[PDB]
Amino acid sequence: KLHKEPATLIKAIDGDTVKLMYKGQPMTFRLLLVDTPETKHPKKGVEKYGPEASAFVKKMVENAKKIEVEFDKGQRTDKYGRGLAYIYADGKMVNEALVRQGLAKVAYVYKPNNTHEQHLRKSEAQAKKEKLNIWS
Numbered sequence: 027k028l029h030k031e032p033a034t035l036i037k038a039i040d041g042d043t044v045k046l047m048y049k050g051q052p053m054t055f056r057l058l059l060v061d062t063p064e065t066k067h068p069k070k071g072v073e074k075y076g077p078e079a080s081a082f083v084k085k086m087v088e089n090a091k092k093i094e095v096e097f098d099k100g101q102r103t104d105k106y107g108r109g110l111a112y113i114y115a116d117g118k119m120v121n122e123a124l125v126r127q128g129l130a131k132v133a134y135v136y137k138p139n140n141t142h143e144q145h146l147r148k149s150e151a152q153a154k155k156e157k158l159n160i161w162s
Contacts, residue, residue, distance in 0.1 A: 030094040041079030060130040079129040090115035100139035128158025
């Protein structure tokens, strides 16, 4: 099954990306399965709810006692060299938290990197139902 490994915050970079110290090396991590509005959009620049989504994972990871990373069963890095993972702050999955708050959508999914897909999609259905943020 999947397993969680410890990491240390280096810097939150955007709503969907954080830099961590992982096994003694600085690495950039892309949050698996979520698309967030971005502040660093390659074309768009700063989208609606981008600052808010980015402020939320900053707070969450900067105020955590314990950060853990959980790789999925497929590829662990994307084509830009970023780790592909579920990130946890004190036991709470940052990826699900963003979706639950209406600050991210579930991304297009690539098997077999889809272990928590159903879980995330349920949280997204709920944020939609509650008309939160991006769904308002």
